[PDB]
Design a protein around this ligand. Sequence first.
Ligand code: CA
Length: 223
Amino acid sequence: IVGGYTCGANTVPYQVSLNSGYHFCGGSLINSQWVVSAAHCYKSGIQVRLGEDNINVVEGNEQFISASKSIVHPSYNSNTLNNDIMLIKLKSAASLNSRVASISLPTSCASAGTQCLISGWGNTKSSGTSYPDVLKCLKAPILSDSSCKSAYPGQITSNMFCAGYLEGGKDSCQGDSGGPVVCSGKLQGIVSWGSGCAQKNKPGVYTKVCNYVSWIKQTIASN
Ligand SMILES: [Ca+2]
């Protein structure tokens, strides 16, 4: 997250870190057994880390649970990032508590102009590199479909939305991929892509979770 703030330990209790020896993407806990992330975050050998604040210090509230299954969307296209969504099943259910909690899936899609909370352990620099240890947060508004399409001509599908600030300075970034975009208390987006981070006229692009709720529900009813 570039231009964000330190969230505060465990104040985003549905945020997970995906670890394959190191943190490599975020995700969102949607119930005690299942995490939503980005398909472009797929790796074999994923451990889900819940209850994290500092990802480099064991502070006492974590749960580390291996994935048993990952399910990339059946129509994911890694070239365009259309349908950039994945489900990860935990080997054992998380113990839900004040610091480890699920986020609701949406009933309706979010509205342009809505301010959403984006979070993660990704790079904090637009130019260069610096990865935080503690979880960072950003409030960013959803942009209109037409502004998003103007920013990325020929690249935005109906399964994507843009959020952020066209003047630059505030965005998600590498390492935030797969993490949540929460709007009015619902998981509306997944950190997916963008050209650089926090650059002028290049806002973040997010997977539009409300298009996937029937897939998510049928998949979790069957696995
Ligand atoms: Ca930790």
